[PDB]
Design a protein around this ligand. Sequence first.
Ligand SMILES: [Mg+2]
Ligand SMILES: [Mg+2]
Ligand SMILES: [Mg+2]
Ligand SMILES: [Mg+2]
Ligand SMILES: [Mg+2]
Ligand SMILES: [Mg+2]
Ligand SMILES: [Mg+2]
Ligand SMILES: [Mg+2]
Ligand SMILES: [Mg+2]
Ligand SMILES: [Mg+2]
Ligand SMILES: [Mg+2]
Ligand SMILES: [Mg+2]
Ligand SMILES: [Mg+2]
Lengths: 39, 179, 148, 259
Amino acid sequence: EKTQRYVKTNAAKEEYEKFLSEWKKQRAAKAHAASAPVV
Amino acid sequence: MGKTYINTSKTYSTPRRPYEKERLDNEMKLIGTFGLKNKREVWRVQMILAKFRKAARELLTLDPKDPRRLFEGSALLRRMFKYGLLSEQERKLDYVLGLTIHKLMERRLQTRVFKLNLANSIHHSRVLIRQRHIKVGKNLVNVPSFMVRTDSEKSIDFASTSPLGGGREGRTKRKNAKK
Amino acid sequence: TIVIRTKKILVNPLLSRRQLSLDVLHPDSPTASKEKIREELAKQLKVDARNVVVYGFSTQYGGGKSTGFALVYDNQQYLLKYEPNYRLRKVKILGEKPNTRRSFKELKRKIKRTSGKAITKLLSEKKGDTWASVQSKKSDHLKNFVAK
Amino acid sequence: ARGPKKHLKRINAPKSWMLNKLGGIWATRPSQGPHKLRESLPLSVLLKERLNYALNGRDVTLILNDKEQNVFVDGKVRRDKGYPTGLMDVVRIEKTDQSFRILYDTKGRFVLKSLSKEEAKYKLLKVTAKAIGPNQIPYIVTHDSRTIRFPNPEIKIGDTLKYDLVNNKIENFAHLESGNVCYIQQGNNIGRVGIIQHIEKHQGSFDICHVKDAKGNAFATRLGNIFVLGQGKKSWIELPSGDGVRETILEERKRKFSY
RNA sequence: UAACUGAUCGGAUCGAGGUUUACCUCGAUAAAUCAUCUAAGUUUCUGCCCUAUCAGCUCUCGAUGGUAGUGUAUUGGACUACCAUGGCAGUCACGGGUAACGGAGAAUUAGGGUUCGAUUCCGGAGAAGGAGCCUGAGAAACGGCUACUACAACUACGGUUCGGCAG
RNA sequence: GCGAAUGGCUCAUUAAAACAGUUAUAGUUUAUUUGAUAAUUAAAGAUUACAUGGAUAACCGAGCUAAUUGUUGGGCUAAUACA
Ligand SMILES: [Mg+2]
Ligand SMILES: [Mg+2]
Ligand SMILES: [Mg+2]
Ligand SMILES: [Mg+2]
Ligand SMILES: [Mg+2]
Ligand SMILES: [Mg+2]
Ligand SMILES: [Mg+2]
Ligand SMILES: [Mg+2]
Ligand SMILES: [Mg+2]
Ligand SMILES: [Mg+2]
Ligand SMILES: [Mg+2]
Ligand SMILES: [Mg+2]
Ligand SMILES: [Mg+2]
């Protein structure tokens, strides 16, 4: 259980991180989608 | 460790003037008209009539479209109806006031048992509703000062009482020795 | 005879039983004896009598109607574990209720003033009725009883 | 005072428990838990007076002490005479697989809503605070005193989450902003459910909020009392007493006895 | 990032139910930090009965403010040191009385008022008077302790009491 | 090991004091509860972790005082105590 602690944490950590790159990728992805039609 | 929490309340009302010639005369003419026992009773009734008018005045103090009046006013009347003090065609609050104590006295288990030819007198009746000789609703009423409601004024007999059930109180004690 | 109407009933699977309000109609005879009420009920439910316990009753001011509450247990073996120690002596299953107070208060007296040595001994003299005892007696009603 | 209080008086125990005035003298005092004293319903109350499964006091003592486990709160077992079941909780009665919502009336009395094995899964959580803690990590906290690890970042402090108890998973949240549905956890207006109109912050130390609903009534209460029962008109849970809307004493009469 | 202390923590503990192995499953409890609940300190503002046959009050040690420190759970003249001289008052200070613990409320009431609130809720204070303290997360506790004042109980007069009914 | 600091009684003190209605804690402590969190055991030392070390109630036996849930004194073994 001591061991399973840092395991579950790495899983959630990399999990979050993996999500962030996908969200942020989209956050900036909509940035040219919104500023494009204004052009 | 005594900490009661039930509630008090006095049904009485002492009069200011203790010897009003004219007032006492009505109280007696009243006690004799309704087979009452003590002046108390008479005040008990006046005190009740009070709560109604004090609540009628309290409500008349309002706009005719007051959420309060509209609701409490009606409900007060609805109650005057269940006890039959005002007739269908006497809605308006203003009528709550013109209520004779003589009228409210007439709607008692006493005043009723007698006016239902169910007794030989305003008094005869009094000992009757006492000896259980009278049942109302699905229950039996012993207390002569019952507030007879319209709806149940039908259900008023003697269920399982010597004058319908199976008597033998003064009879039994009687016939056994005759031999 | 009597006429019973069952009134308000709940279903408690937790304590494994059904709780119900009872309204006995005895227009003529006096208040019904819990005992007799016990069986006219068990019949309407069609359940062993001893698995049905009735408590608390009233009697409207002279009118032949009495209100009360009763209990239906499925396993007398459940009923025996749940019902209160006082309801059992009532069916004459558990027994007595001897006066503990006084003596227990007096032993406190001595014990509070001794060292373990004697204390143990004293304790071997405090008015009986252990819970361990209550159980063995409960248990005996268990095996020795079977039926319906 | 001597130290810390430890009892509770019949008379003093909240009107939300619809308690027996004549009753006794005391009342099971809520145990320090997930919900505050006033905003809670100790189990003993929940079964005895509420459900009515229990009855006498010892009745409970059995139920929660019996080696069978008959009571569940948010997918967990509980054996405390006075666990403070709070708002938006889910209680299951093992031996019957009963599932309930701990929700206030429209008149402010604790009501038990029966759920289908379906809603019994999700529970609505309101966001307490939100800040980052140990080793660069984000934490969110719910009224239900839930502490969350790595939560979606698009969540502002005054949010409302939908919780999948089965997987201890989050899904579809929704902040409080002009145009949502809400439940008011406490106040002269609790038990109501309407559409958020606008939130005027006054910072001086107390922001307020307005609301509309069915008969389009105007409601006013402090933010701390707003719980987002949902995003954009659609509520997220079945409400007790029909829809979260109370009637004039006048409307109650006309609806019941039709006056 | 730098270093300090190491008297902070990082489990030498306990069940039960399973099951041909390598074990498996659900729990007890200890304990650190953050939340949380609970409660407590201290705090802002507003409001009290008679009375000037009470008008000036507080300031040798704190009275009002500033500085630095102590000390505390923390704020603070709360205490020390140094410095400034302020702080309050007829819009009643300061002082005195109260058979005055404050509320929620209680009695009579056209309206406005008059008089009470020891006393079930809440908050406060106290346990013979007064001060001191152990312990603890928590009390100056008081159905705990220490000394003094006045007392209560036993004595073989050496000494002793788990001696305080405003439960 | 917790509890004994809840309750229960009383109002003697006490007129901005206490109280109430309000507010603050960015000026604080909170055992018990509920949620979560911990990969690295500090240096010197020392070192078994399939897991360490020493002592004491209860008990056995001797004893004191006129006296109390007084306590001396010798011998015996366990902990989530202690180390
Ligand atoms: Mg008869
Ligand atoms: Mg006993
Ligand atoms: Mg408890
Ligand atoms: Mg703020
Ligand atoms: Mg085994
Ligand atoms: Mg300073
Ligand atoms: Mg004075
Ligand atoms: Mg006074
Ligand atoms: Mg008190
Ligand atoms: Mg206070
Ligand atoms: Mg006495
Ligand atoms: Mg003040
Ligand atoms: Mg020895």
